[PDB]
Amino acid sequence: MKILFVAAGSPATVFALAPLATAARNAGHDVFMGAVEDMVPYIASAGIPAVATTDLPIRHFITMDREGNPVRMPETPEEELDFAGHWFGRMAAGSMDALREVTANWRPDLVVGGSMSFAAALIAAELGVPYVRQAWDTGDAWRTDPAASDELRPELRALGLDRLPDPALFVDICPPSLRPADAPPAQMMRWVPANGQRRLEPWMYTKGNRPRILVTSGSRLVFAKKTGFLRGLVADMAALDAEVVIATLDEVAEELGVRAGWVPLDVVVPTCDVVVHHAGGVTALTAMNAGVPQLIVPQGGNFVEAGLRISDFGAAITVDENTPEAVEKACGELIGNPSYAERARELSAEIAALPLPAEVVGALEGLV
């Protein structure tokens, strides 16, 4: 069958859908994946036919409303959920014309979207084909839905809807120990990494004679360009008897004797003792899946609550970026206390026991 995958505006959103898209292609299905123009090379470098959904970057949708007026940034975690629903809602609204042009010429039998790829819900409703919602992290996939429904009220009213339509199938990757009590029934799936690759050098897959700490701020150029966070973290680990690796975009690495640049996370994370990040859901999954403890230093966003569930489980520590010596103390505790790695290995075993993307293809086929 013809399956249209809808990613968003960040490389992590392409990576989160690449296992199921490649599994469907491997089963003989005709698969296309859509994302913002800037993300098209990431889809192509995942080996999937790529279509552009809008020529605008995430920064356009984040900083301004539909009328082009400046949007104030969130000040609290409660504000973050509403703010995300709105900018993801705006990106979805800005993606409809290109998705209509593509699906008029190549009509999919099924549409698969990520957590906040709301244009997948809308185009599937317009086409009258089943809509599959795939969680792209261990956070609640529906966590920005009320604000997103409010943003997309004109598009939803045109379809005769009052809120975002419920998917025909919900595909979840959250391991049982991290799933909330109010989580809806789902087709579970084993998350597997599918991040951007590059020529491997021996240091990437071989551990050194010292503990290794990986530091990253994600794959979003608009947030990664704020090098202050990465320089701050590197400065806070100076006293530790540890090798520090900065995993960041190559163009950001240019501005930064510390190793900085794109290092395929799935390859390097099993050689690390700690993974330090900005509260990025897919980096969080890479660490968990490899059974590696992680330090979460939240830089806003909407994964903060889900990252606190990993911390409460004991496979991570959530600290404040602006509490002196907190990053240093937490790194020492994650390397030195074996309980963090034991809980991370427990989460790795839970992920490994979930249905394979190859088996989940059968659930997509059952819908049509």
Ligand X SMILES: Cc1cn([C@H]2C[C@H](O)[C@@H](COP(=O)(O)OP(=O)(O)O[C@@H]3C[C@@H](O)[C@H](O)[C@@H](C)C3)O2)c(=O)[nH]c1=O
Q: Tell me: is residue 278 an annotated ligand-binding position.
A: yes
Binder of its own copies out of 68, 70, 78, 105 (CB under 8 A) = 105
Task: Evaluate whether 124 touches 130 at the Cβ level (below 8 Å).
Answer: yes
Least distance between its own copies and beta carbon 107 (Å): 11
* Residue 150 interacting with Mg ion (CB under 5 A): yes
Which residues are paired to 171 by β-bridges? Answer: 134, 187
Of positions 197, 323, 337, 339, contacts its own copies by CB under 8 A: 197
Window contacting ligand X (CB under 6 A); options: 10-18, 52-60, 179-187, 236-244: 10-18
By CB under 6 A, what part of segment 112-141 binds ligand X?
Answer: 136-137
Q: Is 345 in the site for its own copies (CB under 8 A)?
A: no
Give CA–CA dist 67/70, Å, rounded: 9
Query: Phi/psi zone of residue 298: left (φ > 0), alpha (ψ -120 to 50 degrees), beta?
Result: beta
Q: Is residue 209 involved in binding its own copies (CB under 8 A)?
A: no
Instruction: Give whichever of 285 and 297 is closer to its own copies, judged by the CB atom.
Output: 285
Residue list 198-257, contact with ligand X (CB under 6 A): 216, 218-220, 247-249
Tokens of 15: 């990576």
Task: Say how far residue 177 (Cα) sits from the centre of its chain.
Answer: 19
Torsion of CA 146, 147, 150, 156, to 10 degrees: -70
DSSP 117: -
Residue 13 binds which entry of Mg ion, ligand X, its own copies, none, with Cβ cut-offs from 5 to 8 Å by kind?
ligand X
Instruction: In whole angstroms, give the CA distance from residue 286 to residue 300.
Output: 20
Return the SS3 of 172. strand
Q: Quick one: CA dihedral 341, 342, 347, 350, positive or negative?
A: positive
Our finding on whether 123 is near its own copies (CB under 8 A) is no
In angstroms, the CA 29 to CA 365 distance is 10
Instruction: Return the axis-axis angle of helices 304-313 and 339-352, rounded to nearest 10°.
Output: 110
Residue 102 binding its own copies, by CB under 8 A? yes
- Least distance (Å) between residue 353 CB and ligand X: 22
Is 265 among the annotated ligand-binding positions? Answer: yes
Footprint on this chain of its own copies (rule: CB under 8 A): 18-19, 22-23, 25-28, 32, 40-41, 43-52, 101-102, 105-106, 190, 192, 194, 196-200, 202, 205-206, 264, 266-267, 352, 356-358, 361
Footprint on this chain of ligand X (rule: CB under 6 A): 10-13, 15-16, 136-137, 195-196, 216, 218-220, 247-249, 262-265, 277, 280-283, 286, 301, 303
